[PDB]
Amino acid sequence: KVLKIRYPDDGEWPGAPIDKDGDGNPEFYIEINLWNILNATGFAEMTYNLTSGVLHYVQQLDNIVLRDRSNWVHGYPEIFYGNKPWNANYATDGPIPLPSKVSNLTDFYLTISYKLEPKNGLPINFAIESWLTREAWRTTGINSDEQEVMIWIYYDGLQPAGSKVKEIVVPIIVNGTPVNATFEVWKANIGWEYVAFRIKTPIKEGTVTIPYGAFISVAANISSLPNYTELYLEDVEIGTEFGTPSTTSAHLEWWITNITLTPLDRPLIS
């Protein structure tokens, strides 16, 4: 009834599928994803109640030493839908068929209910991201002619990679009320093209719905990549990146109670 993964007990790379009907196709996949920590004292644990659907993350890390300080952040504990292109983990039991080419995909709303509790000023975000790859089912990383798109709906103490490009309006729903929100658009070249959308009014807790194609359309429009609409939207990842190279302790708790992808009857890109 409860799935639990724990670092370092389960190794340096704990993760697991959420497969509530036991049908061998996960609905979501969870990873502690401390991808830039070489060593730390303490623990991180992610637990998922299969009946309530609550995902609860508890992290108490100290003495943190990074694998490569140029990566900046320490990790990105997360839950995702689709095929994460950095490894062989996937989740495809859901209404949106990911991966799909961006030219063939419907737009969709993403709704998340959550609450974040970083401790003592830990730098952090709550970031949704997708990878856009040239092949349909990538599992071995990302090339220079591909894109990473992130959407930050909370942040404290972190800035996206690269340079600020512009600000856009995106109509979103926050705590049941439709609102016009502003996102800063950032672009970088970090081994691949990176585009990030950082909300100007961070939301630390509640229920937020965003229209995914508002973001992908802007990422396509500002892209320097050729043949953008032939890329595959591999996945939708939701997690909290945390830490900086001068962060040595990172205590954080959060909860996610619902994630829903709702198809729209319109193209993803407009």
Ligand X SMILES: OC[C@H]1O[C@@H](O[C@H]2[C@H](O)[C@@H](O)[C@H](O[C@H]3[C@H](O)[C@@H](O)[C@H](O[C@H]4[C@H](O)[C@@H](O)[C@H](O)O[C@@H]4CO)O[C@@H]3CO)O[C@@H]2CO)[C@H](O)[C@@H](O)[C@@H]1O
Residue 4, marked binder = no
Is 125 among the residues that bind ligand X (CB under 6 A)? no
Residue 249, marked binder = yes
Give, as ranges, the residues between 138 and 157 that touch ligand X (CB under 6 A). 148
51 and 73 Cβ atoms separated by less than 8 Å: no
145 and 244 Cβ atoms separated by less than 8 Å: no
Strands annotated E in the chain: 2-7, 15-18, 28-31, 37-49, 55-66, 78-83, 90-91, 100-101, 106-118, 124-133, 147-156, 163-174, 177-189, 193-199, 205-211, 232-233, 235-239, 250-267
| Alpha-carbon separation of residue 50 from 64, 237, 242 (angstroms) | 32, 19, 26
Residue whose CB is less far from Ca ion, 20 or 67: 20
Q: Which of Ca ion, ligand X, none does residue 21 bind to, with CB < 5 to 8 Å depending on kind?
A: Ca ion
Give, as ranges, the residues between 180 and 239 that touch ligand X (CB under 6 A). 190, 194
177 and 123 Cβ atoms separated by less than 8 Å: no
- Nearest residue to 127 via CA among 223, 194, 68, 53: 194
Find the shortest distance in angstroms from Cβ 78 to ligand X: 7
269: its two tokens: 């890109």
Give the chain's radius of gyration (CA, Å). 17
Residue 156, marked binder = no
Give, as ranges, the residues between 45 and 104 that touch ligand X (CB under 6 A). 73, 76, 86-87
**Binder to Ca ion among 93, 135, 145, 253 (CB under 5 A)?**
93
Residue 120, marked binder = no
Is 89 among the residues that bind Ca ion (CB under 5 A)? yes
Is 241 among the residues that bind ligand X (CB under 6 A)? yes
Contacts with Ca ion, residue ranges (CB under 5 A): 19, 21, 23, 25, 83-84, 89-90, 93, 139
Binding site, annotated residues: 19, 21, 23, 25, 27, 83-84, 87, 89, 93, 249
Binding site, annotated residues for Ca(2+): 19, 21, 23, 25, 27, 83-84, 87, 89, 93, 249
